[PDB]
Design a protein around this ligand. Structure first.
Ligand SMILES: [K+]
Ligand SMILES: [K+]
Ligand SMILES: [K+]
Ligand SMILES: [K+]
Ligand SMILES: [Mg+2]
Ligand SMILES: [Mg+2]
Ligand SMILES: [Mg+2]
Ligand SMILES: [Mg+2]
Ligand SMILES: [Mg+2]
Ligand SMILES: [Mg+2]
Ligand SMILES: [Mg+2]
Ligand SMILES: [Mg+2]
Ligand SMILES: [Mg+2]
Ligand SMILES: [Mg+2]
Ligand SMILES: [Mg+2]
Ligand SMILES: [Mg+2]
Ligand SMILES: [Mg+2]
Ligand SMILES: [Mg+2]
Ligand SMILES: [Mg+2]
Ligand SMILES: [Mg+2]
Ligand SMILES: [Mg+2]
Ligand SMILES: [Mg+2]
Ligand SMILES: [Mg+2]
Ligand SMILES: [Mg+2]
Ligand SMILES: [Mg+2]
Ligand SMILES: [Mg+2]
Ligand SMILES: [Mg+2]
Ligand SMILES: [Mg+2]
Ligand SMILES: [Mg+2]
Ligand SMILES: [Mg+2]
Ligand SMILES: [Mg+2]
Ligand SMILES: [Mg+2]
Ligand SMILES: [Mg+2]
Ligand SMILES: [Mg+2]
Ligand SMILES: [Zn+2]
Ligand SMILES: [Zn+2]
Lengths: 98, 129, 99, 25, 150, 91, 83, 150
RNA sequence: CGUAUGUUCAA
RNA sequence: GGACCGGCGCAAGACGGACCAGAGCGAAAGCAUUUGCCAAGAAUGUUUUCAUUAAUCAAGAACGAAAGUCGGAGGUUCGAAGACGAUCAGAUACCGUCGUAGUUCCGACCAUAAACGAUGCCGACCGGCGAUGCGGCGGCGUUAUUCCCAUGACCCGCCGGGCAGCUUCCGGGAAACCAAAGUCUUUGGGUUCCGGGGGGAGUAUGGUUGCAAAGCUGAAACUUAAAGGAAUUGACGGAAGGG
């Protein structure tokens, strides 16, 4: 249910939305106030996970803890590389911000 | 799957004929089926039939007159030259007095006697007697 | 020559049925082929039921019954006269013998 | 002779025949 | 000479500003940077050290004290473990199953490491060569090769 | 091109030791030298340093594992059982 | 019955027969005019609907999917549409 | 019957003889075709788009209202999927079965079903390549297919 | 509980 | 030296009774304590979508009871082998007392079974009747859901897919029988495998696979006038029933 929804909704962003895949870019987007949602893979480093959560709390945006590792988060994004964290700037046609 | 609509139709008519039924539903319907049925109608072996339009292959209802002994298809549709037509008659028909071999020729679908008159060979479709 | 349409067993729409052990000889017989007999009878026979009645300490004590389910292989069922041979047409009859 | 045991007889005969050739090669 | 890995674990000292480094038998699954907790009130996790009294029945343990406070004597070789079978809260005793299959009654204050000893399956590999056996015992002691008495 | 029919990694042992010993060691010989996927960082860079010691060259994590594989079936079974028993001690 | 008239079977006979096996196939489904107790507007709903139909604006459930005909919400009046 | 099952089921849709649009439909061809665009842009497959139109908008057959099939409408507007939906859903199923097998390698049934699914994928992909719907060298790569679907 | 066997041809 | 039996308690390993059916599911092999998780599937329903994408299949590939083999764990029970006690003319057996391998779990092999419905698959047609399981639809009434609502349990039908059953001068067949084993001298829907008197012989030999056991492919010389099927009448039976 939730896992099926999140991958299908995440696939819609990758073809219609604005996003950045990576840790440095995610911090750049959060700082500018452009990030709408932040998604973290479950094997994200604990310090990195805690730092991004603190960054999002200051930016007053939401953090979703993906139910997969950076390998499966990358596959969900449709990319052939690992993605540990990402930020969604424009949801596009999807409704991940629900 | 269904490889031959004509084979299905002729078999269905043959079974209802043996069972003494007065009407038989034929599905699906094809120009080859209708032309074959017409050849049997012109010789009285079957009564009137009504093609039914379903915006699909079609269904037919044939009125049976209790005259068919057998309406069988020949598969595959062998090419029949005029010289070889006689050997086909000796093999498919009970006697020369009655029974017909339905041929598809360039002239059109016709029985074996009309093909001999029009001097056209063709591909064999079936027979009835 | 086939003798029975069901091949002597009740297996119709499955491949394998777990076997059970014959009550007499412990032979392995498929559960669908075993000649079954659910035996219900009083613990005390009808001869001794009267003696137990006035030997009992209760005014109206109903005698408990004994429930034993027997499974028989074909050889033991025939030998113990649980079932018998039947004619060509008598075999087809499936209703249990009358009470 | 029972067919199953005729088969077992021949299997034993074959095994002997293979040992006789493994000894000569 | 040991088939089981060892873990360098650093604890704060309670009484002095000083770090204490302890050499542990490595329970399989532990990793560098992992916190391990030792005590009566520690949680039941791989690598933690708890008294066997507080462990539930069926717990798999390693590096188990034979006597209370002996700092670990039982199930120390690679791939070995002990099982907590039962408790006797009245007598403060615990029954365990040792790798040999023997069942031993020990005090419930005996500590152990939750989990199995790392390096298991070592004996599965055929040594193949006399030279590999030579190097194996050269790190242990002078006991190889062995001449038959006959 | 395919160089060996069946020996594979244990072709280095030549005709020595016996086919059964070479076959038995082949599975261990492969898994011992394989590179596994690090769970901590996701890269396929977890390889055996010593017997029972596995190291990832990227995140510099060292893991106590099996003699010839990253984790043994006994270890994963124990971890599941310990996780259950922890819940039983809890609610 | 040897002489059964296949051209003109009774409407009862056709209504029983499987939709594909009728003389000329026709659906057993239909569309309907659904009115929830609230508001006033009318919603066109398929009889064998597969999606939960929401009265837009009113934001109420009109029908629930089932294995067959959709189950109308309680208090909702429906009338078959004609074509 | 089914190509990869012993089932001989007949369940399907019986399309009515009358192709004309009913009088009670106030939705014009363009208005329906613009509603298709919203749903496809929302990320719905042609199959699904037809259900929402049939269930809540009275559009029995988009082809009857507009003269064009939904996928054919989406191709004109450029909203058509890169991969055909039927092929996409068979690939998605194969990925899910293959994910299950990695953690359940004793599931010989899942191994059997996967061979059937991949057989249908190749039969379908062979057809699409012939009608020139898929590039002339599209191959199903079970290893790299997980990124395409979901 | 517990036993086996019956030379060749010939109506 | 306290067996068996009775009571309490503990340990281990196997097994899942009765409910359990000519019932269900699965491509077969096969599948039965509870609960959770994972992925899958037929049928039904559909005024959804694609639009011939299909049927069958040399080569090729996945699965494949039991026994068997290899490595590890376990080892209650049963139990090839073996030992013994009986029985017997003998008894290397049937019976009995033990009991190894195995039986059990995990991982790799093996590829065979009366793996049988001794009956290829896909498609069409051809009598009737009572059920049954799954899905949907319709309809008096009973019952719970406290009243309503729907939903379940029951009752009466219909449709579709299935396991079957009874009956029938459909028709077939050497008959036993079969609603398919029918729609065949009135001989042709499509397609795969495969038989050509009995043996020799699934043997030899070559190839190939396998750790092995073996699997697959597979002859010839020679020999023979029957071997065989179904059914009938008798005789016989350490078969039953009645005298
Ligand atoms: K003589
Ligand atoms: K006792
Ligand atoms: K039925
Ligand atoms: K006789
Ligand atoms: Mg007999
Ligand atoms: Mg019979
Ligand atoms: Mg029986
Ligand atoms: Mg020395
Ligand atoms: Mg030695
Ligand atoms: Mg020595
Ligand atoms: Mg389907
Ligand atoms: Mg097929
Ligand atoms: Mg369907
Ligand atoms: Mg003698
Ligand atoms: Mg004599
Ligand atoms: Mg004699
Ligand atoms: Mg005489
Ligand atoms: Mg039970
Ligand atoms: Mg083949
Ligand atoms: Mg296999
Ligand atoms: Mg087996
Ligand atoms: Mg075995
Ligand atoms: Mg073994
Ligand atoms: Mg003896
Ligand atoms: Mg015994
Ligand atoms: Mg065979
Ligand atoms: Mg069987
Ligand atoms: Mg056979
Ligand atoms: Mg096939
Ligand atoms: Mg069912
Ligand atoms: Mg023929
Ligand atoms: Mg022959
Ligand atoms: Mg050979
Ligand atoms: Mg025979
Ligand atoms: Zn018995
Ligand atoms: Zn790493």
């Amino acid at each position: 249910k939730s896992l099926e929804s999140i991958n299908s909704r995440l696939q819609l962003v990758m073809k219609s939305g604005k996003y950045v895949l990576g840790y440095k870019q995610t911090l750049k987007m959060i700082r500018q106030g452009k990030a709408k949602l932040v998604i973290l893979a479950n094997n994200c480093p604990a310090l990195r996970k805690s730092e991004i959560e603190y960054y999002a709390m200051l930016a007053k945006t939401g953090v979703h803890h993906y139910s997969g590792n950076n390998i499966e988060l990358g596959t969900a994004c449709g990319k052939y590389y690992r993605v540990c964290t990402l930020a969604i700037i424009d949801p596009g046609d999807s409704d991940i911000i629900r | 799957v269904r490889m031959n609509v004509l084979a299905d139709a002729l078999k269905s008519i043959n079974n209802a004929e043996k069972r003494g039924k007065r009407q038989v539903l034929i599905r699906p319907c094809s120009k080859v089926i209708v032309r074959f049925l017409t050849v049997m109608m012109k010789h009285g072996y079957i009564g009137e039939f009504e093609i039914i339009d379903d915006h699909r292959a079609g269904k037919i209802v044939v009125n049976l007159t209790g005259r068919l002994n057998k309406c069988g298809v020949i598969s595959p549709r062998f090419d029949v030259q005029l010289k070889d037509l006689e050997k086909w008659q000796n093999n498919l028909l009970p006697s020369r007095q009655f029974g017909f071999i339905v041929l598809t020729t360039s002239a059109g679908i016709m029985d074996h006697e009309e093909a001999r008159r029009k001097h056209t060979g063709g591909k064999i479709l079936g027979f009835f007697f | 020559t086939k003798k029975r349409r069901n091949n002597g067993r009740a297996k119709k729409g499955r491949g394998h049925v777990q076997p059970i052990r014959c009550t007499n000889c412990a032979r392995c017989v498929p559960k669908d082929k075993a000649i079954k007999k659910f035996v219900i009878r009083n613990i005390v026979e009808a001869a001794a039921v009267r003696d137990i009645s006035e030997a009992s300490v209760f005014d109206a004590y109903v005698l408990p019954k004994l429930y034993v389910k027997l499974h028989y292989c074909v050889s033991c069922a025939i030998h113990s006269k649980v079932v018998r041979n039947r004619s060509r047409e008598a075999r087809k009859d499936r209703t249990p013998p009358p009470r | 002779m029972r067919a199953k045991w005729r088969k077992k007889r021949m299997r034993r005969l074959k095994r002997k025949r293979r040992k006789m050739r493994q000894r000569s090669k | 000479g040991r088939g089981a890995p060892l873990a360098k674990v650093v604890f704060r000292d309670p009484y002095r500003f000083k770090k204490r480094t302890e050499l542990f038998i490595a329970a399989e699954g532990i990793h560098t940077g992992q916190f391990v907790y030792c005590g009566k009130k520690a949680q039941l996790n791989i690598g933690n050290v708890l008294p066997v009294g507080t462990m539930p029945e069926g717990t798999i343990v390693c590096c188990l004290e034979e006597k209370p406070g002996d700092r670990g004597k039982l199930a120390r070789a690679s791939g070995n473990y002990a099982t907590v079978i039962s408790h006797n809260p009245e007598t403060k005793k615990t029954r365990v199953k040792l790798p040999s299959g023997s069942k031993k009654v020990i005090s419930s204050a005996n500590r152990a490491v939750v989990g199995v000893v790392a390096g298991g399956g070592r004996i599965d590999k055929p040594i193949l060569k006399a030279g590999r056996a030579y190097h194996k015992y050269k790190a242990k002691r002078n006991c190889w090769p062995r001449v038959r008495g006959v | 091109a395919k160089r060996t029919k069946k020996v594979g990694i244990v072709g280095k042992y030549g005709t020595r030791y016996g086919a059964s010993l070479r076959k038995m060691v082949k599975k261990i010989e492969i898994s011992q030298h394989a590179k596994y996927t690090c769970s901590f960082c996701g890269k396929t860079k977890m390889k055996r340093r010593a017997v029972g010691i596995w190291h990832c060259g990227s995140c510099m994590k060292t893991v106590a594992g099996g003699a010839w594989t990253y984790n043994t079936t006994s270890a994963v079974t124990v971890k599941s059982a310990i996780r259950r028993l922890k819940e039983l001690k809890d609610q | 019955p040897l002489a059964k008239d296949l051209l003109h079977p009774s409407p009862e006979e056709e209504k029983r027969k499987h939709k594909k096996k009728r003389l000329v196939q026709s659906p057993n489904s239909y569309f309907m005019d659904v009115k929830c107790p609230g508001c006033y507007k009318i919603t066109t709903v398929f009889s064998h609907a597969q999606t939960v139909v929401l009265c837009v604006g009113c934001s109420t459930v009109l029908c629930q999917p089932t294995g067959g005909k959709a189950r109308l919400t309680e208090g909702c009046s429906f009338r078959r549409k004609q074509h | 019957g089914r190509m990869h099952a012993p089932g001989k089921g007949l369940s399907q849709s019986a399309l009515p003889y009358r192709r004309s649009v009913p009088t009670w439909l106030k939705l014009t061809s363009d208005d329906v075709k613009e509603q298709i665009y919203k749903l496809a842009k929302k990320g719905l497959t042609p199959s699904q788009i037809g259900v929402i139109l049939r269930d809540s908008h009275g559009v029995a057959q988009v082809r009857f209202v507009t003269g064009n099939k939904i996928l054919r409408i989406l191709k004109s507007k450029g909203l058509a999927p890169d991969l055909p939906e039927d092929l996409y859903h068979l690939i998605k199923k194969a990925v899910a079965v293959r994910k299950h097998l990695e953690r359940n390698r004793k599931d010989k049934d899942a191994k059997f079903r996967l061979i059937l699914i991949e057989s249908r994928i190749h039969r379908l992909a062979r057809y699409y390549k012939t009608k020139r719907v898929l590039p002339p060298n599209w191959k199903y790569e079970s290893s790299t297919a997980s990124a395409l679907v979901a």
